[PDB]
């Protein structure tokens, strides 16, 4: 009932993954709201239900497929389907609980987890922090398998949570940040797996604040600096929009554009 974007890990290349993320971005935003050369996601307020979600179908070489559902308002994963079973993170209010009844409507075997999909919770359930969870094409292939096998009784919760952490970073965070897409491209290019460095983690943690600072900026300057980290962990402050233009590919809606 929603647009679907397909990707496979089998034989994935820098190009196939790049083309995939581009398609995700193209379905998350209309392109009609662009500020400081950064697209803004749709405003949630009053957003019609047919416009609310997109579907991302992921397959691997073992012929397993899962379909993730992403909320267009924040690019984040809300649940998934494996065969004719569906699983949803705990929703935050009655409107969102109602919204997710419109996902995978041909699935009656539906379950809503008692937990949400935020990193703090998922790291607790996984027993590991993002800094110790490897990302790459291999991790993504394995995450697809683990999500699929939850539906057969074959994945326990820590592995499920780890697999969500992988998918959210490699799909949602890569769509949000061109820099993170680049970090995933490096892993594909060199056929390697590795945990995200501090630059990635701190960007992920800062997406909402960066979206605010950009949309509330005045003369391209932030009202208050945001502290980020370099790849070596060293800390630096950002005061202006321009240097973030290549880094950020999408922003959550915070306010109406200037008159």
């Amino acid at each position: 009932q929603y647009p679907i974007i397909n990707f496979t890990t089998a034989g994935a290349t820098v190009q196939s993954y790049t083309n995939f993320i581009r398609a995700v971005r193209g379905r998350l935003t209309t392109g009609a709201d662009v500020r400081h050369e950064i697209p803004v996601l749709p405003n949630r307020v009053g957003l019609p239900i047919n416009q609310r979600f997109i579907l991302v179908e992921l397959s691997n070489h073992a012929e397993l497929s899962v379909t993730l559902a992403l909320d267009v308002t924040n690019a984040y994963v809300v649940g998934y389907r494996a065969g004719n079973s569906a699983y949803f993170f705990h929703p935050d209010n009655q409107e969102d609980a109602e919204a997710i009844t419109h996902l995978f409507t041909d699935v009656q075997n539906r379950y809503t987890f008692a937990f949400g999909g935020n990193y703090d919770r998922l790291e607790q359930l996984a027993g590991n922090l993002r800094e110790n969870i490897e990302l790459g094409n291999g991790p993504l292939e394995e995450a697809i398998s683990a999500l699929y096998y939850y539906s057969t009784g074959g994945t326990q919760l820590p592995t499920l949570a780890r697999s969500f952490i992988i998918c959210i970073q490699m799909i949602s965070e890569a769509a949000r940040f061109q820099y993170i897409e680049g970090e995933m491209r490096t892993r594909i290019r060199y056929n390697r797996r590795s945990a995200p460095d501090p630059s990635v983690i701190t960007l992920e943690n800062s997406w909402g604040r960066l979206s605010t600072a950009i949309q509330e900026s005045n003369q391209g300057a932030f009202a208050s600096p945001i502290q980020l980290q370099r790849r070596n962990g060293s800390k630096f402050s950002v005061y202006d929009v321009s240097i973030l233009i290549p880094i950020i590919a999408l922003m959550v809606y915070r306010c109406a554009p200037p008159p």
Partner: protein, 129 residues
């Protein structure tokens, strides 16, 4: 793997220069390419970058409207056209490969490859060759 820069020199204020960054041993087509500059006693800084996707270009505020980056895939070369040069543009200029454009703000990537640099000096009066 080599990245060779040429085109630097002494130019007058208001003048123009075109730098070249030519690759050997690999293809520039599938990387972002950035220009960076190091001026005396100053932090090394990203100047301009061109993506491997759809030719998207990015510029530091200080050079917007004066510098233009472009890529000639057939020649495995990237160029930096520098117009309306100012004394403040004097620096050693470097090109580097990256996966995506960052203007250097997160530091060097472990697999990024940098050239050895070309000096650009903006002054009306002669200087060291």
């Amino acid at each position: 793997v080599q990245l060779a820069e040429t085109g630097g020199g002494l130019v007058q204020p208001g003048g123009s220069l075109r730098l070249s960054c030519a690759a050997s041993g690999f293809t520039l087509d599938d990387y972002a390419i950035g220009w960076f500059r190091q001026a005396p006693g100053k932090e090394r800084e990203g100047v301009s970058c061109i993506s491997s996707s759809d030719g998207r270009t990015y510029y530091a505020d200080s050079v917007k409207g004066r510098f233009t980056i472009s890529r000639d895939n057939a020649k495995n070369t990237v160029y930096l056209q520098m117009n309306s040069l100012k004394s403040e543009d004097t620096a050693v200029y470097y090109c580097a490969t990256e996966e995506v454009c960052t203007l250097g703000i997160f530091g060097h990537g472990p697999d990024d490859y940098w050239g050895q640099g070309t000096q650009v000096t903006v002054s009306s009066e002669p200087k060291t060759p």
